[model samples]
Target: VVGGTEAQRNSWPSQISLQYRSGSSWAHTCGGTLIRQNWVMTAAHCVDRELTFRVVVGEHNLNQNDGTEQYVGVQKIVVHPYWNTDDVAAGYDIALLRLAQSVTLNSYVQLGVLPRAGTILANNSPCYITGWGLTRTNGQLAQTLQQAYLPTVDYAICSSSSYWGSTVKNSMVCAGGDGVRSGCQGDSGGPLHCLVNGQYAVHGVTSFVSRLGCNVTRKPTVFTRVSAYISWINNVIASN
Candidate 1:
């Protein structure tokens, strides 16, 4: 049910697959963005719980039939200090993972810069999201990377009565459509990329609250705005 082969999945410059083993099962945890040789950006929720996890770069398949799969122990998992499970509006659903070992940079796996804030991401903005999330509710996640084009929804539309409105904060932006194409359950922590100046820039990290059935129309897929957290991110990277 997963879309695209390893080669096809690796086509997107920012896609990463997060994996972890629990009990006798090895599962795909979430998606992530390669921000540096030793740093990756992912949803705070993914790492909020303790687990032994690894990040696979330059790979499209979980079976590891192609590309290199590196197991890097987490040196530190830094979540926003303000992040609270009770309050979703705190705008702190972001996290950074420092790999114990450095990954070799390759053309397929490279770091990307964050974009500035207050910049409107509009429809047809040429943004894409890739992940191994479920193709539909109750289905298994696709082994091959699946990708979808995301159209930026206006704040007005996103904040409307049916949308996030008051809950949508300055730290978040919305993308996706009503069940047509979106970031599903397993897609959390994936990269939301925008093409800028012939290079891909990571603008957001897949966060939370996307409808389960993918039935929210005009509701934007929420992502952690990377621009606002540059200082925190830099500080974490520097200290480590």
Candidate 2:
């Protein structure tokens, strides 16, 4: 995340590192939310590469051996049926990965709570985008998890011509168009945790940012609204 600060260890317990095998090592490619003991929610485009993938729970540092980390192979990956790699602007960018084994819950690892169906955050609602994305557009990834306060930009305002315009949809959420703090490359599939009723819920799956730059003015980060896909997520978990 561009212009973010190092996140407190275990602050976002449900956050996960979605990595792909590169040479003899695994590289963090995206962030994900641990929705269940064996289920992780991420952006569909993150896994479009067709490479082997694994998830690391409780990971704080990308280079250090965080002893709390739980590495597990992805048993199955289910991308939204309507998602198209060529058309991310059309929404439906969410995906779910079934873990090889259920991870144990602890202070450093837990399940992310999902927002209720049809729930929408008020304009400028308090929220944070957490991940190990880039520190700047076209920059290297962070060594530790990073977080930025990214206020929610309601659909109406986000769809304004100067902002996301036609690309923003009700099925998506926009946040942090301030041109300072925002999601960047490698942040895809991370959680946008919004404070609602004194609690935080996973409301967004980081999807895209402006093509011009990661922190471009009037182009807030876009996310797949998690509330819009609760039923879809439930269906996938129940059957798989």
Among these predictions, the greatest TM-score belongs to 2
Q: Write the per-residue lDDT of candidate 1 for residues 1-240, one digit (tens) a residue.
A: 122223364466556777787888667889898888888889888876678888877777776576556656667788888888666566788888888888887666777678865565665466776788777655668777877777666667776778787878767777766556777777889888777678767887888654445424555678888877888888988987
lDDT of 2 by residue, 119-204 (tens): 99999999999999999999999999999999999999999998888999999999999989999999999999999999999999
Candidate 2 residue 213 Cα shift, in angstroms, is 0.5
Model 1 residue runs over 4 Å out of place are: 1-7
Cα-based TM-score, every candidate: 0.89, 0.99
Clashing pairs in 2: none
Q: Give the alpha-carbon lDDT of every model.
A: 0.73, 0.96
Best by lDDT: 2
C-alpha RMSD values across all candidates: 2.5, 0.5
On the 0 to 100 scale, the lDDT of residue 43 in model 1 is 86
